[PDB]
């Protein structure tokens, strides 16, 4: 494509300071296993890909590696195999706008994730945010322009300060895959009714959309994903239009005293002077302390919401086992769907305790309120089927125990994934090397 | 006494600007009936004085008037009559340090509220916060000193900025009346553990303390009251030691050009220049909009928490009615106690949406979590008693209907109060005038 250069090294000794700091996200290499740290999530996501594997994000340099390696994308043997579609590449690589610009959105989104393996081998890079070889910013994905239009803030009419967050909003948002034949597997941001948890809930309910049917409760479930842009808009910094870039890509000075934009996307406290100290006079120790306090508050309510949902899902499973009808279960499943949507949207962003802690805490409160409705209705229904005692919860104290409770063959899944990693990934990179040898 | 002057006019000509702005809290005279606006509260406080009458605070000039007029103090015919004790005067008048200094705490707290009628007639004034005829600040109540010592911040070692909030903390706190024999009727702040909702819950459970037994659920209840200091400490302004005085008693300039401390304690937005604008560049409309949005979020979770509690109380009443035993109800009552403690502390301060919105939202979330646990246990227990259908809630849509549901003879209460107002209060004021003549 004329508009995209997916090879990130092309403009490196033309834009040295930007390339070098961009490459330094490789320094953020630790992989924290969130399922291991919180096995409740295996149960909440039962029947869905996230019950297999879910880790915290690390540096942008690892995006293609991590989508390749997660158990969620499976072990496809050919371009028509594997569980997930092409759309799983969309926020991982500057080869995505290359493919969209050459084949159109309809050509890009067609088919399996495995199909794009040979084509999507460059990780998150310059062409995702920039015009080719230029410092100018751009939106490189058409579905992003559609989403910005939908909330009335098109990129073409946005201020410089607005665009700084919009380039991150290409990826750091809640999304779903459309179902209609002409948009099958297209990425869409569910923003037509607004970006609050309540508006998005109305959107999804209006089209009767579900990401999966829960393996225990049979609830039509919604999955939230990293809603940084939607939740940043709710926090006081976003209300002041303090941009993602102000904290995550701050203006820094070279050893020679030249200012440039720090491209090492990571922890803003690592550049405390240049980030928080730009606008605040408090010490780093104070502001780190405040941030850790909100993380603790959000975590407390997160676990309370999760404990209610775990019990709700097993209680619903027991209700089905005791002969509940679909009509008896319909209002309970609605409550479970909404309760878990609210928990998931509240904490799916690993930055929410910094970006919008009060919104996270409000939303987790509404989660518990819906879970309480579901569980009281379940307690009455279970009693009509003859059970007036608590429903037993199996041992789910570890990720391995939870996945086994669900009947998941983790040994086989890991073995097949390792064989895929060893056999298929070399072939993909060998094909990409051959193709890039043109260009 | 030597160290207190309760007549607030004595130094009016020496300190004209302070006296004049102090007297201007009489401009804040609107009375908002909180029970009328939220009749749920009648049910939540069933069996307690707050089910009778509860209004939003107004100006300091009305403290003695409102404590005289509230149905909560009833209609005493003599100094040993009436529902409430001497300690209800403690945060309403500079006559209180006068009586404490002359009679001791033991002498002051002894007896009924009606006994203090003739002695406590000056409203909140200069000697409550100041040394006599002086600009120096003081703590005028010994139980406040004990509380400050308990949290490790004695007034003697406090900074200027610390002391600005501490004078408000003499009254704007959660408290209880001790029941121990040697301290019976004493005001104490429940801060030994210290000031979060969770620490105070541990404090109260450790001494097996209850304010009343709920009229419906028979739960041993805790009542929260206006925890401004404790919640201010949790908000970001308090963490920065932005004092109550910075927003509510700002430095202003007289018409003659003289700088002084504004003593019109009221809405900080009424002094936007001089309060927020001294630290913030945003417009007043923007900051008002933010505070209004937080008020709405807090109100949304407040109402969800109350709906859960109202149903829990009626469901518990049903369980008792169906023959539940003490042992069956014990874990349910514990959950209701904690759930309502958390609700009440979260919203008992009318400023919590400005002072600490994130803490109010966290605490309201934990309220719903405990109410959930109570209602699920109740649904199972009700089913063991043969009831598998929802418990009916009577019409409680107005203050009047809710009080009638509880069997409250509001007509008699109001008649007896008006009679008390017409007959007793002139006698109290006449005796005080006679006594103050001898000053
Ligand atoms: C199709 C269902 C997929 C799959 C299989 C993956 N993604 Fe994404 N992704 C996006 C962003 C902003 C992040 C970092 C923020 C965060 O994770 O909270 C990620 C992260 C990942 C990972 C690493 C972490 C993990 O979950 O283990 C993996 C393995 C992963 N993704 C796989 C952004 C997006 C999107 C932007 C709209 C899209 C679409 C996807 N991701 C889709 C998928
Ligand atoms: C791949 C290694 C690159 C290269 C070579 C560059 N970028 Fe970026 N960039 C991003 C943002 C938000 C800005 C600020 C824009 C502005 O203030 O107008 C920049 C800035 C630049 C410049 C301009 C000079 C400067 O340092 O300020 C240049 C020359 C540049 N970049 C080169 C955003 C992003 C990304 C979004 C996550 C990504 C990816 C990149 N840039 C990648 C690259
Ligand atoms: C606009 C300048 C931003 C900002 C501020 C961030 N991103 Fe991204 N991001 C994407 C994916 C898939 C990941 C996970 C990577 C992986 O786990 O392999 C991330 C990761 C992050 C982080 C975590 C960094 C760390 O060191 O832990 C952060 C702080 C972050 N992002 C912020 C996806 C994308 C994009 C897809 C092309 C785009 C564009 C951005 N992110 C842009 C931004
Ligand atoms: C604009 C919408 C964004 C986006 C997309 C992100 N941020 Fe932030 N962020 C800030 C701080 C202090 C943290 C936590 C640092 C810590 O944990 O110590 C975060 C966290 C994130 C994450 C998660 C990072 C991870 O490794 O898990 C992500 C993906 C993220 N942010 C993206 C600080 C700020 C701001 C300061 C006022 C601003 C504005 C933003 N971030 C904006 C955004
Ligand atoms: C760097 C990572 C940080 C951190 C840790 C914080 N900020 Fe900011 N901040 C800015 C503005 C305009 C406000 C609103 C208040 C005001 O009008 O001054 C804030 C507010 C905060 C808070 C209070 C909100 C809360 O979370 O309790 C906190 C704790 C906070 N900040 C921490 C402005 C800016 C910036 C201007 C572009 C920048 C950069 C930052 N802040 C960065 C940080
Ligand atoms: C330290 C300077 C303060 C500040 C900032 C406030 N108070 Fe008080 N207060 C007390 C009582 C009994 C009331 C209710 C009076 C009534 O309704 O009759 C109040 C009221 C307030 C308000 C509401 C003002 C309004 O205009 O509505 C406000 C903003 C307020 N207070 C703040 C009791 C006391 C004390 C007991 C003697 C003392 C000391 C303080 N308050 C101190 C302060
Ligand atoms: C003994 C049980 C009583 C009674 C009957 C009253 N008080 Fe107080 N009071 C205090 C503060 C800071 C306020 C204003 C803040 C707020 O109300 O949220 C009040 C207000 C009142 C009112 C007017 C409002 C109402 O409830 O209608 C009334 C009628 C009232 N009080 C009666 C402070 C304190 C204390 C400081 C530790 C103490 C002790 C009391 N009050 C005790 C009582
Ligand atoms: C009853 C009408 C009075 C009078 C005559 C005065 N006060 Fe107050 N005051 C309070 C606080 C926190 C301050 C600031 C203290 C400081 O910054 O050191 C003041 C200030 C004064 C002064 C000093 C001159 C000035 O205007 O700054 C004077 C002479 C003065 N006051 C007289 C607190 C309170 C109260 C707490 C709620 C109340 C009640 C009063 N003051 C009452 C009076
Ligand atoms: C220090 C511990 C205190 C105390 C005792 C109080 N405040 Fe504040 N407050 C602020 C704002 C913007 C409001 C809302 C005004 C509005 O409703 O528009 C409040 C509210 C209160 C109340 C309730 C007022 C009422 O009339 O019902 C009370 C009793 C109260 N405050 C006492 C602003 C601030 C601050 C701004 C940074 C500071 C600090 C404080 N208040 C501190 C305190
Ligand atoms: C007058 C009643 C107000 C109002 C409405 C607000 N402030 Fe303040 N503020 C101050 C400090 C140090 C912070 C922390 C952030 C920082 O370090 O700059 C804040 C924070 C806020 C916020 C953001 C937090 C939130 O609740 O979202 C808001 C909305 C806010 N303030 C409003 C400092 C001060 C003061 C210095 C003495 C004064 C006065 C005020 N603020 C007054 C007000
Ligand atoms: Ca989604
Ligand atoms: Ca109390």
Curated annotation (Swiss-Prot), chains A, B:
Catalytic activity of the protein: 6 Fe(III)-[cytochrome c] + NH4(+) + 2 H2O = 6 Fe(II)-[cytochrome c] + nitrite + 8 H(+)
Entry EC no(s): 1.7.2.2
Binding site residues for heme c 1: 88, 91-92
Binding site for heme c 3: 60, 168, 171-172
Binding site for heme c 4: 244, 247-248, 355
UniProt-listed InterPro entries: Cyt_c552, Cyt_c_NO2Rdtase_formate-dep, Multihaem_cyt_sf
Cofactor: Ca(2+); heme c
GO molecular function, one term: heme binding
Residues the entry annotates as binding heme c 2: 126, 129-130, 263
Keywords: Calcium, Electron transport, Heme, Iron, Metal-binding, Oxidoreductase, Periplasm, Signal, Transport
Gene3D superfamilies membership: Butyryl-CoA Dehydrogenase, subunit A, domain 3, Flavocytochrome C3, Chain A
Xref: PROSITE patterns: MULTIHEME_CYTC (PS51008)
Residues binding heme c 5: 237, 276, 279-280
Quaternary structure and interacting proteins, as annotated: Homodimer.
HAMAP family reported for this sequence: Cytochrom_C552
Function: Catalyzes the reduction of nitrite to ammonia, consuming six electrons in the process. Has very low activity toward hydroxylamine. Has even lower activity toward sulfite. Sulfite reductase activity is maximal at neutral pH.
Protein name as it appears in the record: Cytochrome c-552
Gene: nrfA
């Amino acid at each position: 494509s004329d508009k995209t250069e997916p090879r990130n090294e092309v403009y490196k000794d033309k834009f040295k300071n930007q390339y070098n700091s961009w490459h330094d996200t490789a320094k953020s290499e630790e992989l924290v296993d969130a399922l291991e740290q919180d096995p409740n999530m295996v149960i909440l996501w039962a029947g869905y890909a996230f019950a297999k594997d879910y880790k915290a994000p690390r540096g942008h340099m690892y995006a293609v590696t991590d989508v390749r390696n997660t158990l969620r994308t499976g072990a496809p043997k050919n371009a028509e195999d594997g569980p997930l579609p092409m759309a799983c590449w969309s926020c991982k690589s500057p080869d995505v706008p290359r493919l969209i610009e050459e084949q159109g959105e309809d050509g890009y989104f067609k088919g399996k994730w495995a199909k794009g393996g040979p084509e999507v081998t460059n990780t998150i890079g310059c062409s995702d945010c920039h015009e080719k070889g230029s410092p100018k910013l751009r939106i490189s994905r058409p579905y992003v322009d559609r989403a910005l239009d939908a909330i009335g803030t098109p990129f073409s009419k946005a201020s410089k300060q607005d665009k700084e967050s919009m380039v991150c909003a290409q990826c750091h948002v809640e999304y779903y895959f459309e179902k209609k034949e002409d948009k099958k597997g297209f990425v869409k941001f569910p923003w037509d009714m607004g970006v609050t948890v309540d508006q998005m809930e109305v959107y999804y309910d209006g089209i009767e959309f579900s990401d999966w049917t829960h393996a225990l409760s049979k609830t039509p479930m919604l999955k939230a994903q990293h809603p940084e842009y939607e939740t940043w808009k709710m926090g006081i910094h976003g209300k002041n239009n303090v941009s993602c870039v102000d904290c995550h890509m701050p203006k820094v000075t070279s050893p020679e005293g030249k200012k440039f934009t720090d491209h090492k996307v990571g922890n803003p406290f690592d550049r405390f002077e240049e980030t928080c100290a730009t606008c605040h006079s408090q010490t780093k120790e104070f502001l780190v302390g405040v941030t850790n306090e909100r993380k603790a508050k959000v975590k407390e309510m997160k676990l309370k919401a999760e404990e209610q949902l775990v019990k709700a899902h097993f209680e619903a499973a027991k209700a089905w086992e005791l002969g509940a009808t679909e009509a008896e279960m319909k209002p309970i499943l609605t409550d479970i769907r909404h309760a878990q949507w609210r928990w998931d949207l509240a904490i799916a962003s690993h930055g929410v305790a910094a970006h919008a802690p009060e919104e996270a805490l409000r939303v987790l409160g509404t989660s518990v309120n819906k879970a309480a409705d579901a569980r009281v209705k379940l307690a009455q229904l279970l009693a009509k089927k003859g059970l007036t005692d608590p429903v037993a919860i199996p041992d789910i104290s570890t990720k391995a125990k939870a996945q086994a409770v669900l009947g998941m063959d983790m040994e086989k899944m890991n073995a097949e994934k390792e064989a895929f990693k060893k056999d298929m990934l070399p072939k993909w990179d060998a094909e990409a090397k051959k193709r890039e040898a043109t260009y």
